[PDB]
Amino acid sequence: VLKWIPRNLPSCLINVESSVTSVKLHPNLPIVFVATDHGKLYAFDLFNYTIPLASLQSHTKAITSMDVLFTNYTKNYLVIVTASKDLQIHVFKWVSEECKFQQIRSLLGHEHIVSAVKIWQKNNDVHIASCSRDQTVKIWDFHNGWSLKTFQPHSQWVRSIDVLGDYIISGSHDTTLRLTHWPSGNGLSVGTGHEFPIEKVKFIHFIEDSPEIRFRTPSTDRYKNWGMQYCVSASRDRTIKIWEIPLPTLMAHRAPIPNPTDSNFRCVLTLKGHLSWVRDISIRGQYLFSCADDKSVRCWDLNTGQCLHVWEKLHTGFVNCLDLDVDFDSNVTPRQMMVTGGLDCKSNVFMR
Amino acid sequence: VLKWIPRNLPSCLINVESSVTSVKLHPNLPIVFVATDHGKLYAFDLFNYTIPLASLQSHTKAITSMDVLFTNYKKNYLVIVTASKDLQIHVFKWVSEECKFQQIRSLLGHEHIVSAVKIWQKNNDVHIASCSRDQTVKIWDFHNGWSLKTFQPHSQWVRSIDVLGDYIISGSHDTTLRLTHWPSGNGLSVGTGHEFPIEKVKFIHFIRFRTPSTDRYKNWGMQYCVSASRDRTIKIWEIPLSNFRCVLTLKGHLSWVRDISIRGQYLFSCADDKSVRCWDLNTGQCLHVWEKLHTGFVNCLDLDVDFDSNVTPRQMMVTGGLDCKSNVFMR
Amino acid sequence: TDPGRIPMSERFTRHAAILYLGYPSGKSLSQIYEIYYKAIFKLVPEFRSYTEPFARASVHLYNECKARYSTGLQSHYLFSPRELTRLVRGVYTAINTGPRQTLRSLIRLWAYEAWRIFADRLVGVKEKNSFEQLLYETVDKYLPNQDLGNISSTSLLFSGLLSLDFKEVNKTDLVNFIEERFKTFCDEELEVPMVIHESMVDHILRIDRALKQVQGHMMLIGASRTGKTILTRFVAWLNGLKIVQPKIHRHSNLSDFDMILKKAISDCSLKESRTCLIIDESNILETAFLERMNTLLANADIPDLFQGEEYDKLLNNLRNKTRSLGLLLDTEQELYDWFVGEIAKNLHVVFTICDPTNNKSSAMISSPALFNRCIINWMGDWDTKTMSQVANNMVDVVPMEFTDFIVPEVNKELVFTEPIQTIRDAVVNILIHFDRNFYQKMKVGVNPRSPGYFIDGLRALVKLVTAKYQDLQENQRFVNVGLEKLNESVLKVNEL
Amino acid sequence: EVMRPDIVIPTIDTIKHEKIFYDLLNSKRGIILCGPPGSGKTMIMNNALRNSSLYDVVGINFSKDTTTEHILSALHRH
Amino acid sequence: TSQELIGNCIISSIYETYFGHLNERERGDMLVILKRLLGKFAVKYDVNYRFIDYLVTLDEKMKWLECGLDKNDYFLENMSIVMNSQDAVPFLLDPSSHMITVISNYYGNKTVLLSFLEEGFVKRLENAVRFGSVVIIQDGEFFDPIISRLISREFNHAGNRVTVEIGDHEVDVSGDFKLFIHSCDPSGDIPIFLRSRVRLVHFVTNKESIETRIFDITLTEENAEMQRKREDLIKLNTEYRLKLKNLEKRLLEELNNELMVTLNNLKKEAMNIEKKLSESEEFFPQFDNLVEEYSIIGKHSV
Ligand SMILES: Nc1ncnc2c1ncn2[C@@H]1O[C@H](COP(=O)(O)OP(=O)(O)O)[C@@H](O)[C@H]1O
Numbered sequence A: 001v002l003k004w005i006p007r008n009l010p011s012c013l014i015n016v017e018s019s020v021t022s023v024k025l026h027p028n029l030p031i032v033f034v035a036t037d038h039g040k041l042y043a044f045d046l047f048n049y050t051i052p053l054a055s056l057q058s059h060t061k062a063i064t065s066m067d068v069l070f071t072n073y074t075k076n077y078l079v080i081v082t083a084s085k086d087l088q089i090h091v092f093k094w095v096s097e098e099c100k101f102q103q104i105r106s107l108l109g110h111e112h113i114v115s116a117v118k119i120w121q122k123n124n125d126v127h128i129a130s131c132s133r134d135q136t137v138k139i140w141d142f143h144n145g146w147s148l149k150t151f152q153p154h155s156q157w158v159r160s161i162d163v164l165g166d167y168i169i170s171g172s173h174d175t176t177l178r179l180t181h182w183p184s185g186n187g188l189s190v191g192t193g194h195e196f197p198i199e200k201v202k203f204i205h206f207i208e209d210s211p212e213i214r215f216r217t218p219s220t221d222r223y224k225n226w227g228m229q230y231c232v233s234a235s236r237d238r239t240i241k242i243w244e245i246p247l248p249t250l251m252a253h254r255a256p257i258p259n260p261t262d263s264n265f266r267c268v269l270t271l272k273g274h275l276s277w278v279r280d281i282s283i284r285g286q287y288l289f290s291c292a293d294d295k296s297v298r299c300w301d302l303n304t305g306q307c308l309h310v311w312e313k314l315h316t317g318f319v320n321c322l323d324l325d326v327d328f329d330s331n332v333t334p335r336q337m338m339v340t341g342g343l344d345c346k347s348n349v350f351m352r
Numbered sequence B: 001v002l003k004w005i006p007r008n009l010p011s012c013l014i015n016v017e018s019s020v021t022s023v024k025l026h027p028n029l030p031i032v033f034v035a036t037d038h039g040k041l042y043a044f045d046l047f048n049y050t051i052p053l054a055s056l057q058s059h060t061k062a063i064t065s066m067d068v069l070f071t072n073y074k075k076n077y078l079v080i081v082t083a084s085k086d087l088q089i090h091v092f093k094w095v096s097e098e099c100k101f102q103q104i105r106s107l108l109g110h111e112h113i114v115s116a117v118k119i120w121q122k123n124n125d126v127h128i129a130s131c132s133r134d135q136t137v138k139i140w141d142f143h144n145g146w147s148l149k150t151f152q153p154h155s156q157w158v159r160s161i162d163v164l165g166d167y168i169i170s171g172s173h174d175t176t177l178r179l180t181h182w183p184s185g186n187g188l189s190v191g192t193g194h195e196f197p198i199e200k201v202k203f204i205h206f207i208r209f210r211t212p213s214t215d216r217y218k219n220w221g222m223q224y225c226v227s228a229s230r231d232r233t234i235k236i237w238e239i240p241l242s243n244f245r246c247v248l249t250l251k252g253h254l255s256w257v258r259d260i261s262i263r264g265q266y267l268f269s270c271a272d273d274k275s276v277r278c279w280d281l282n283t284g285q286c287l288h289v290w291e292k293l294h295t296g297f298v299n300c301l302d303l304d305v306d307f308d309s310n311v312t313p314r315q316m317m318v319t320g321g322l323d324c325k326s327n328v329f330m331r
Numbered sequence C: 001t002d003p004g005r006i007p008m009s010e011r012f013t014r015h016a017a018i019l020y021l022g023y024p025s026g027k028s029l030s031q032i033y034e035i036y037y038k039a040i041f042k043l044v045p046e047f048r049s050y051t052e053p054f055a056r057a058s059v060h061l062y063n064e065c066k067a068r069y070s071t072g073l074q075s076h077y078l079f080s081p082r083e084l085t086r087l088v089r090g091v092y093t094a095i096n097t098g099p100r101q102t103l104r105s106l107i108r109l110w111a112y113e114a115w116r117i118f119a120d121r122l123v124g125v126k127e128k129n130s131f132e133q134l135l136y137e138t139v140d141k142y143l144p145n146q147d148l149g150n151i152s153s154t155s156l157l158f159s160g161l162l163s164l165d166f167k168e169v170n171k172t173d174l175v176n177f178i179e180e181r182f183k184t185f186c187d188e189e190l191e192v193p194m195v196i197h198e199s200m201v202d203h204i205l206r207i208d209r210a211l212k213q214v215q216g217h218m219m220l221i222g223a224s225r226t227g228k229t230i231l232t233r234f235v236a237w238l239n240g241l242k243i244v245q246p247k248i249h250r251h252s253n254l255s256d257f258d259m260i261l262k263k264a265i266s267d268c269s270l271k272e273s274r275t276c277l278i279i280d281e282s283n284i285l286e287t288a289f290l291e292r293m294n295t296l297l298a299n300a301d302i303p304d305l306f307q308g309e310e311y312d313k314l315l316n317n318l319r320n321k322t323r324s325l326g327l328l329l330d331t332e333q334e335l336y337d338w339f340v341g342e343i344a345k346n347l348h349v350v351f352t353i354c355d356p357t358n359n360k361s362s363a364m365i366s367s368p369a370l371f372n373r374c375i376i377n378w379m380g381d382w383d384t385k386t387m388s389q390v391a392n393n394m395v396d397v398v399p400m401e402f403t404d405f406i407v408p409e410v411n412k413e414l415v416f417t418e419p420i421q422t423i424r425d426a427v428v429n430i431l432i433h434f435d436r437n438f439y440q441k442m443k444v445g446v447n448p449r450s451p452g453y454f455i456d457g458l459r460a461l462v463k464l465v466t467a468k469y470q471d472l473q474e475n476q477r478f479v480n481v482g483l484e485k486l487n488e489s490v491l492k493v494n495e496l
Numbered sequence D: 001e002v003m004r005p006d007i008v009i010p011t012i013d014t015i016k017h018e019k020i021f022y023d024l025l026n027s028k029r030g031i032i033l034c035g036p037p038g039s040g041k042t043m044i045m046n047n048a049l050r051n052s053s054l055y056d057v058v059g060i061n062f063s064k065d066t067t068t069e070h071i072l073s074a075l076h077r078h
Numbered sequence E: 001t002s003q004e005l006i007g008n009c010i011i012s013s014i015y016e017t018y019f020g021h022l023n024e025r026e027r028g029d030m031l032v033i034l035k036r037l038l039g040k041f042a043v044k045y046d047v048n049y050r051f052i053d054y055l056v057t058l059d060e061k062m063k064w065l066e067c068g069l070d071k072n073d074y075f076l077e078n079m080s081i082v083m084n085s086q087d088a089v090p091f092l093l094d095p096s097s098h099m100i101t102v103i104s105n106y107y108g109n110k111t112v113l114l115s116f117l118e119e120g121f122v123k124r125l126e127n128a129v130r131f132g133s134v135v136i137i138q139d140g141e142f143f144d145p146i147i148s149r150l151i152s153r154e155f156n157h158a159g160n161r162v163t164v165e166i167g168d169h170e171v172d173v174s175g176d177f178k179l180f181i182h183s184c185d186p187s188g189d190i191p192i193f194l195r196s197r198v199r200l201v202h203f204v205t206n207k208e209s210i211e212t213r214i215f216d217i218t219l220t221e222e223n224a225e226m227q228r229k230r231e232d233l234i235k236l237n238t239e240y241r242l243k244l245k246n247l248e249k250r251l252l253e254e255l256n257n258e259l260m261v262t263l264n265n266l267k268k269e270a271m272n273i274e275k276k277l278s279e280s281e282e283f284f285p286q287f288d289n290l291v292e293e294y295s296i297i298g299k300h301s302v
């Protein structure tokens, strides 16, 4: 059920007025969330995509990113976090019966434009992470609405982040990546090897059962306790890179400290083949999906390392983002659909 | 899919400055275009209808007709042609990256009040056909600006026109509505049978009359058409491939029918009786009727085109009203 | 004889044997570049039999360009076998980083390189037309191959921006890519509201070609406000270079310029950051700055910056950086030539010149260290086609066609826009005609004509037409509403 | 190897110049080369001296501001 | 009025952008050529066009004149070019150094005078940019390139604010900040970077201006009654036009929601406007007779 591959043609095509910037999928219903260059947030039904289920204008400028989350309290509901160039972040509630956006709150405090938001829940506690052009990654509490942490991990402005427990990896415009421990706020490791600003960076989580996977398994019990093996990055030099995360000086029931000899990323793999800036990356099962500004979407294997499938001329303009269902989450069923959104004021969905 | 039954109540109550003269729908967006009696052009969001998106004073007088067409060939864009009582045919394009109207050019030359406009696209050429009260119809050019030819389709004033291919059908104030060829400019047939002026006359495209009748009709591409008169009735015609036949007699409206629109087998028509009725083309009887939709009469109705593969036939239609309000029907 | 070279005392030259090395003849150049093209075409063995016609065509092109565009026309029309060597290097560089080639593709690529090497310094339009006809004659005489397209400057768009290899890109796709990249550039960098025309795309392509070469320097000559600095910054942003513009104001001397140059060199070597240094003609105030630039350009280092303690700490930093990458270097010569190799690899100097008639810019162009290394690109002033494209892209957003227009019957050569059909074409033609007449009757001479007047007039016209049309429509609507109300009132009076 | 600036295609003029250059230095005589700016003085010169088992190179590129200190320092390392 | 909108807009825009640095004869010749080009390409323009009558209101003209502007038509047109330059930084080449007082009177206490030879130039310029004061920089022949990014308007938009990099640091700009450059040497070396981007306006006195000023002086001391009458009818016609517009707005408000008195007053005002136009149609060309009479004095004076 993890070996699903989209066919050569999109299952449905969605027309929106302006350039699509971010796309997310509803983890329980066939609903696609599309945020565009006017800041307009759209909710489309997959089987009835002629008109949107909802459409709301909340930002005065272009939305740069999105992330959704279905809450799991020990009521359950969907939280949509949309960040834009108006220096603010907006947090919305999705109402299933009303089929209408109900904005919960807004988060302020970023000096310049904000480029990425990630929302995660650990145990009855939901936090919102964000990175902005004022070079400060900030995390708020979702319930409180006040800022808990801010830290500057880079010299230049950071572009993408990722969350996994209490560790954040961040890529920036200074073509370097950096892993930091969030509670301590200290840069655990730094990494170089890209020659252009980083578009997307996310962790490569673990999976339980498979025939064989090389990038989603621990090599030892120490890595199993660590909880993360490698990471994936994409940048404007038309390359994707899989980096091995080195380990820092770890102590039990204590804040981790960086290792002077083991505080540098190791570039394990370098996947090339995209003709322009690789915008977005996404990993489902054993396959890694990516898009670039070459009007194409490429599906690679983590094991072999070469491009199995190419979807060329998928958009008239650039391709801006993808979204696939999360595979490593027990509570999120990895359903068989992949959605992409491009600069030609359009989105595509591949189903079955 | 194409058999959607509109709800008995409105979904969005768009408020305009004056009485709505004509309505239009974005072929791929949930944006409506509303024309007022002051010549202003209104753009509304169908999910946030409180504030208009863009309002521009197009014409000084009241707008008599308007139509839209998304170009499909040079980036494609929406084209809005607006005609009014000022003997001026304004042309506009709606940019989505800024959400505002952009004036392209004005088509001048008519010596009287314009009646109706229609936009159809060739393989790579866009044309606009506008008819005035001087009993003359001129074929315009979108990119160039000047006319191609001028023909007189009727001895009296003409009030409606529709274009489908190389043939154009025009409905005059007299009951002798006639169809004429655009490039040839020679009349073929003229048919009467009504006692009141025709308010709307448009072709019926193939999708009882939705299919071709014979091999000659299938080769020609035109088999039947429906016209609306002021005699409170709807008449379906049959253009020969030199006198048309009459076998359909449908009525029921208490006032003059203003505009009609064919969406598949079902047909929706509006009248001046402040009511909306959907009359089936097969049974010829009204099934769904809407009462107290607006205080004033209904001026125009717009529906998605089901005859175009490049236009999505959404289950959303709008009807114009004279009570300074617009009715939007969703799902 | 030439400026820069000073006559020498006979008391010294009487002790040295004087040897005159003339230019090699046609046969010698043909043999040398036959060998060079054989070395190139070892990459593409299926076209190994075309080395002789390519070398003969290159040599004949060099001879014809030397004979036609003499120094009497312009002072910078100096040709040499160095141009042929650069042609060979460009053909090899493009063949190495390209796809599988055909004979038509090879001929078009060689013609593109010949355009970019022999005919970027040409000033006049008639000279560029003569070069285009010369390319046609050379290709017909030496490479008789059919199904070969237009060989003009704008019909040869070879670029590696759109793909992974240096191939010939479509004009429309390249224009769309450049528009999107420039929107992103304006979003992330300084905002300049530019208009993308065909000459802009061609200039972007050649600046990108020059900035991708090892030790690839530039010398952009043209009128003011023609887009030299902004295209240099955009192209260096495309290639990932770091832009350094010397902020040399009037209260500056050799200390500040030398500090800027030393910081740039230190960043290039000790940090391995590629740098594009944009030297303007207004930054070089005195001749000593020009001498420093000549030292930096002819060699790969400035020895006057590092001396004594500065030289010692520079060598210490060099040894530290060499040990950082784990290279076994111990001698001072190894550290120094690795340093100058890093400078020649990671530094690109782009010279911006606005008034070549001026004596300072004449010394700039005529300087031997700059003329023989910097790739001269005479952007010049806008022609009527570029002006028409910019004006059409600027007046297409304003409401202009509202009144009746009768198409004028004017002469064919008096219309620069596509033939007149609307009022916008007439407006564009009027603006171009008045720009030409104004610059003719102010006696500008052979000086370059900045298009700043044209662009400012277009912007002012757009704003004024917008405001005037708004006022006119408001007044017409006011009088029509009032007249309708008056008619309704008089009808109500007559009814009652 | 076309990007190497030190490569020289051996023609008959280059060999003639190399031979007369060797004969002139073997006569204990200084040499001044002259010609047009792209004639090939530096390239032929460096080819003649680099491919010789009898002569080494101490290269100085003279500029407008040149003193005898530069010449003495360049001689000092050899 | 509508059929001659684009031609008049073309003439006005070209007059603003091109003619700021020309004397009277060159302006007249270039305007004649521009009108010929408009007539060749079938674009209709007002045959009685005047730049002041098209872009300068009477209120703004009196505001300029009371601030210290000369009564010359050339100086009025130059001031119109100066204050309509919203984008390009205006450059004022005044040998008499008089327009500094005029601009200071126009902007009041907001005007701050800086110089290109002051030591504290950059810091107080940054303070003026942050505050938003109208700066006038004297000694334009010694332009300092450190403020070059202010000339080219190459700002960067940080979120909701706009910033410019001056010297070695980024400073905020204000929406009311204006920059004027002033020079007194007609032979000064204006850099090409500055000259290509500024609205160069020449407040100089020329021999064509000698002929024009000779005519003006012989008009205002030979028969000043005619000039006074012309000014009186111009002011009266403008005031009556404003009064007619106000009364028309009042009549429209009354009709939308006495009436006979308002209609009678409107008819009387319209008749008065017609009579004033009929009287002024027989007086203006007689001024041309004075132009036909005082040409020899101008020729002899030059
Ligand atoms: N399409 C265009 N191509 C070139 N220049 C343009 C274009 N559109 C506008 N410009 C003008 O070019 C100027 C920027 O050019 P710039 O490179 O600063 O000139 P310079 O060559 O003097 O450095 C802008 O001020 C603008 O007015």
Ligand SMILES: Nc1ncnc2c1ncn2[C@@H]1O[C@H](COP(=O)(O)OP(=O)(O)O)[C@@H](O)[C@H]1O
Residues within 6 Å of the ligand: C024, C032, C081, C082, C085, D007, D008, D009, D010, D011, D014, D036, D037, D038, D039, D040, D041, D042, D043, D044
């Ligand atoms: N025999 C040859 N082999 C290879 N290249 C040659 C030959 N003769 C001349 N050239 C070319 O002539 C040019 C002369 O360059 P250079 O020696 O630097 O000139 P100068 O000595 O005047 O500075 C070189 O670029 C070289 O490519």
Ligand SMILES: [Mg+2]
Residues within 6 Å of the ligand: D036, D037, D038, D039, D040, D041, D042
């Ligand atoms: Mg030389």
